[PDB]
Amino acid sequence: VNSFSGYLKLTDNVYIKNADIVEEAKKVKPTVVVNAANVYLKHGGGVAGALNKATNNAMQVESDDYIATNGPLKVGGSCVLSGHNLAKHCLHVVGPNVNKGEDIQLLKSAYENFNQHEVLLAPLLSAGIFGADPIHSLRVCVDTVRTNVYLAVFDKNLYDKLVSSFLE
Numbered sequence: 026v027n028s029f030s031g032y033l034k035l036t037d038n039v040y041i042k043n044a045d046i047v048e049e050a051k052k053v054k055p056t057v058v059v060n061a062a063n064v065y066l067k068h069g070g071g072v073a074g075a076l077n078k079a080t081n082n083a084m085q086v087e088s089d090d091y092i093a094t095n096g097p098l099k100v101g102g103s104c105v106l107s108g109h110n111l112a113k114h115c116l117h118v119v120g121p122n123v124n125k126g127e128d129i130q131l132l133k134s135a136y137e138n139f140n141q142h143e144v145l146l147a148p149l150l151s152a153g154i155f156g157a158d159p160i161h162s163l164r165v166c167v168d169t170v171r172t173n174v175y176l177a178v179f180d181k182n183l184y185d186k187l188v189s190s191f192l193e
């Protein structure tokens with residue numbers, strides 16, 4: 026249905042809201058919801074952990090099946106799997122793990138996957154356990170994605186810092 030509302034428009038195509046991406050998915054019912062994944066699609070926490078939990082582990086079983094057939098993803102790569110009860114499709118995207126020393130330029134490649142989809146509900150890739158600077162991730166998203174991206178930022182403190190950092 027893609028009935029997004031409450032988002033602050035940052036650019037022609039990038040929108041931001043302070044919300045839980047799970048809550049937004051069940052209110053919006055988007056065509057595509059983005060997961061901030063690892064290369065093994067092991068959904069152990071953060072966005073992935075919340076999305077998986079909202080699918081009742083169904084997302085995890087499907088993801089294991091994908092990994093069993095294709096093997097781990099590449100950092101910066103993606104794969105289109107089922108959205109289950111949250112969306113039509115889930116676009117799993119692997120941002121770089123900057124904490125481990127992975128190349129942050131792979132964050133451009135990660136966001137580039139967004140361009141194959143007309144509208145996405147998405148988180149800030151690599152901005153959590155992967156330790157990428159939140160402002161930088163939003164900048165690469167803005168500089169990279171040309172389709173319509175609705176970013177759900179769970180943390181209010183981070184949301185206010187991104188809005189003022191961008192719209193100011």
Ligand SMILES: Nc1ncnc2c1ncn2[C@@H]1O[C@H](COP(=O)(O)OP(=O)(O)OC[C@H]2O[C@H](Oc3ccc4c(C(F)(F)F)cc(=O)oc4c3)[C@H](O)[C@@H]2O)[C@@H](O)[C@H]1O
Pocket residue numbers: 044045046047061062063067068069070071072073074075120148149150151152153154155156157159177178179180
């Ligand atoms: N519900 C939400 N809705 C909207 N936005 C949200 C939401 N929740 C977070 N964000 C925000 O999204 C942005 C991205 O953060 P993420 O950490 O989800 O993604 P990432 O940085 O690209 O790293 C990718 C990895 O994370 C996941 O693995 C883990 C594993 C363990 C933990 C643990 C702990 F078990 F070790 F303790 C604590 C923890 O907090 O997170 C983990 C992530 C996933 O399997 C992948 O391997 C941040 O700005 C965050 O603040």
